[PDB]
Amino acid sequence: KGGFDYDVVVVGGGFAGATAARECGLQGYRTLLLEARSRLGGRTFTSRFAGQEIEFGGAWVHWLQPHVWAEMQRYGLGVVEDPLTNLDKTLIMYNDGSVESISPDEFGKNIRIAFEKLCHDAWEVFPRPHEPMFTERARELDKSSVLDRIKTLGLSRLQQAQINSYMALYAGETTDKFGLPGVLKLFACGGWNYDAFMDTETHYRIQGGTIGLINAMLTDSGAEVRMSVPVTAVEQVNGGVKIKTDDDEIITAGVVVMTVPLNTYKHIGFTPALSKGKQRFIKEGQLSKGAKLYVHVKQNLGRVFAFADEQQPLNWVQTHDYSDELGTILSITIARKETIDVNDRDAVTREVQKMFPGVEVLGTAAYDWTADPFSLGAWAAYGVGQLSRLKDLQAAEGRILFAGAETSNGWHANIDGAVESGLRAGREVKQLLS
Ligand SMILES: Cc1cc2nc3c(=O)[nH]c(=O)nc-3n(C[C@H](O)[C@H](O)[C@H](O)COP(=O)(O)OP(=O)(O)OC[C@H]3O[C@@H](n4cnc5c(N)ncnc54)[C@H](O)[C@@H]3O)c2cc1C
């Protein structure tokens, strides 16, 4: 349109990027997508362990999540139900390492009590969860951490350990740092209702894996897709942009959509400088230091669930599969990488054995999202005061647009939020290229 190599370049092949490329490709724009890694998905990654398909990152979807569910209808993708109902064993590991077996009914009842107390005012604070700063109350609450509220709730020891564990997981961090409104807003997105919100958590996966939806969008898009091309700089010039790759290739474009994780912006030079509000976000970054671990054990433990509080590593434990022949594959999410050397098998083994004494570890598979230069962190987790400034992160900068789950209004800790932001970006591109 103005002599550039491309109409639009999308940086990042996660869901935010795939969605944006799809929106732009179908408009008939000459569209390029650049991905730093040699694989697609970003903070979703479909892989294999002990002869079965697994998800190392984002995995779970629901019909109460509007953007991803519509995409699933478009591409004809069904759901797979993970065995999260009628549990056999439910455990809590407290800060000091002691393990308590709770009866599954009681376990469920207690986390319910604690969660409903934590999110008691979600309807008044977030009557419009897709406009987070609609009410003044949402703004004033952003002066508080989740821990500040937790301390006022009068929870039992069990209740407090369960909820702190849950929030540690959501934060990818200790709960003193974790912003209170973010959590409320999410609960609000799931119809301000415990049962509804829980059904969205870790229940339904995408049939064919996350990679299937990514491929379906990129295949639909007609965009050129380049793998193993990290972007190192963006300069605004001649009514478009010059994009520099790590090999010192220069690609010109009318517009660029940045979809990279917030914590990775420091790897990219911008000319001119981004706005001060945006520089603040980039220097703070996003909290989460999460990692993902699968352990195969010989013993058949059936359907298990465990919380560990934030001072212990194995914070969220769930059964991926079980049988007498298989044994059990445990799906474990770790809130803070620092709490466990996830690539040291002797350490992982001892930790698993602390949780389940007398278990025999047949194999492990891990993904350390904090060591990966193209994530440098896990899922989006807002610190105190970040949510109320979110517009700084979203705002167009001349011909640079921004997307990614961090920048979404709704389900910011989810695939759905990435999709949302990609739809926004597609629209902002059209407006610029119109
Ligand atoms: C361990 C883990 C588990 C999760 N589980 C769930 C879940 O169960 N359900 C759920 O809904 N959500 C989950 N999430 C979050 C969910 O994955 C995100 O909300 C969403 O998928 C992120 O999409 P994105 O496109 O914004 O980011 P990303 O997926 O991170 O995409 C960013 C892309 O940019 C690329 N990139 C980075 N730097 C450059 C560069 N310089 N040049 C080019 N490309 C670059 C990256 O390689 C990556 O492909 C999870 C996240 C993690 C980390």
Author numbering: 49 to 482
Q: What do the authors say?
A:
Using this structure as a search model for molecular replacement, we then determined the crystal structure of the NicA2(21–482)–FAD–nicotine ternary complex at 2.25 Å resolution. In both structures, there are two complexes in each asymmetric unit. The nicotine molecule is bound midway between the S1 and S2 subdomains, with its pyrrolidine ring facing the FAD-binding domain. Unlike other, related structures, NicA2 does not have an associated diacyl glycerophospholipid, wraps its substrate more tightly, and has an intriguing exit passage in which nine bulky amino acid residues occlude the release of its toxic product, pseudooxynicotine (PN). Interestingly, the substrate nicotine is completely buried in the interior of NicA2 and is not accessible from the solvent when viewed from the substrate entry or product exit site. Only when the surface of NicA2 was set as transparent could the molecule nicotine be located deep inside the active-site pocket. When the product exit passage was investigated, it was found that this exit passage is blocked by many bulky residues, including W364, Y214, Y218, F355, F353, E249, F163, M246, and Y242. We hypothesized that the molecular deceleration via the severely restricted product exit tunnel strongly hinders the release of the reaction product PN from NicA2. Therefore, the substrate nicotine is deeply buried inside the active-site pocket of NicA2, and the exit passage is too occluded to allow the quick release of PN. Our results indicate that the passage in wild-type NicA2 effectively controls the rate of PN release and thus prevents its rapid intracellular accumulation.
The nicotine oxidoreductase NicA2 is a crucial enzyme for the first step of nicotine degradation in Pseudomonas putida S16 (DSM 28022). NicA2 from P. putida S16, 6HLNO and 6HDNO from A. nicotinovorans, and the nicotine oxidase NOX from Pseudomonas sp. strain HZN6 (21) belong to the family of flavin-dependent amine oxidases. In the NicA1- or NicA2-catalyzed reaction, flavin adenine dinucleotide (FAD) is required as a cofactor to couple the oxidation of nicotine with the reduction of oxygen to hydrogen peroxide. The structure of NicA2 comprises a FAD-binding domain (residues 49 to 129, 250 to 338, and 417 to 482) that harbors the cofactor FAD and a substrate-binding domain (residues 130 to 249 and 339 to 416) associated with the substrate nicotine.
